[PDB]
Design a binder for this molecule. Structure first.
Ligand SMILES: [Cu+2]
Ligand SMILES: [Cu+2]
Ligand SMILES: [Cu+2]
Ligand SMILES: [Cu+2]
Lengths: 127, 127, 126, 126
């Protein structure tokens, strides 16, 4: 709605595959946590938002950027918002302006750690 | 909780990847719907529950059973509960006894329509 | 100059990366479907677009129906494609290499509903 | 009598079904890793168990660490396995065919954390 708590676990999945953002809000907050036991260098997760069209490009380039850049191309203009890459027992939050999004456009959230985006992706919709 | 509403969509995903069942309840109800536009013979979804150990065997045998058996081996003793296979606009509900489950055992829910179990799977735990 | 690709009953291609040599005039893709499932349940095509266009092609294809092989007719974003095949079938497509640009990211995928989740790979001209 | 399997940077094996002829005494699996990612990020092994035992092998292997190749040592459910490899590496494993039973469902998979979601296939003796 206005804020969502998302968990990325050791089973390589987020708790949810769909987020809806209330268009009447000015900002939207994503709180990311990592239940489980594996550290970020093996089962790291971030939360990255792009249009569905741009997802593939963001993932491909992020995979090539490495752990120390949180598997994201620095200053990637396609990334609307993102957290850092976290491991078990860590947390990160990102707040972004809702006007960065528009109705009728399809958005996807995903993890860019290599391989994870096959399962760790979902839709975000403005309503 | 005691009941959960689950949606399976045209993007081949359920809305959630984790369900928690309250141990104090006698029964648990899953309500499944299918938003979207594709019919069951193309983008059919069911909700099927087994232990994690048994999932592979249920999926493999279900795939071989065909559309008219809802992609499930009839009388499969590994299936704890399941809905029927539904397509867009349809709904099904299943209620099962919570004592069919035990604490400490890992359960998985999934769709057995050919190919779907790769992303349409999640964990179910008794708390 | 050609490649043999298989799409199976487990909703996967046997390769997720193709490199096309720029000195080639034409490139051929031979698609086969090992397995037992029919086209209506586990159909696969090989469709090529830029990486940026993939999502649009997939979404418009999904809406086009089985009768049109889940591909929008005359889709300008589609550089080349096979037909949609079932188990035991095969198809081949040949396209002109100069249609591709060196330095551009291209993707191949299946447009049957849901398949593109796993049935995708990259194609690059080198 | 042998098969060649590739595990890539896109977390997939190149085949998801192997059939072993029961007239063979031994069977050899040669595993390679195309791509560029290192073992710690995109490591792959080839591990064989019955289909009913897969989940237990994967779960216990996840907890065993990179230093043990994500496999519980002396796991009695593991029929055969390679070591965990990174890109540019190769390993082979040979196993006695009579260890497998005709009519049982076997699975091969990678035990690197999360990989088994996609890196799995069936193996049957015929
Ligand atoms: Cu991740
Ligand atoms: Cu389904
Ligand atoms: Cu397909
Ligand atoms: Cu692996």
């Amino acid at each position: 709605e206005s804020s969502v708590d998302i968990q990325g676990n050791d089973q390589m999945q987020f708790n949810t595959n769909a987020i809806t953002v209330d268009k009447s809000c000015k900002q939207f907050t994503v709180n990311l946590s990592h239940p489980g036991n594996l550290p970020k260098n093996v089962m790291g997760h971030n939360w990255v938002l792009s249009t569905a069209a741009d997802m593939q490009g963001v993932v491909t380039d992020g995979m090539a950027s490495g752990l120390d850049k949180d598997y994201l191309k620095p200053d990637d203009s396609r990334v609307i918002a993102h957290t850092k890459l976290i491991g078990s027992g860590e947390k990160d939050s990102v707040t972004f302006d809702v006007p960065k999004l528009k109705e009728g456009e399809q958005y996807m959230f995903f993890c860019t750690f290599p391989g994870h985006s096959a399962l760790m992706k979902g839709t975000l919709t403005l309503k």
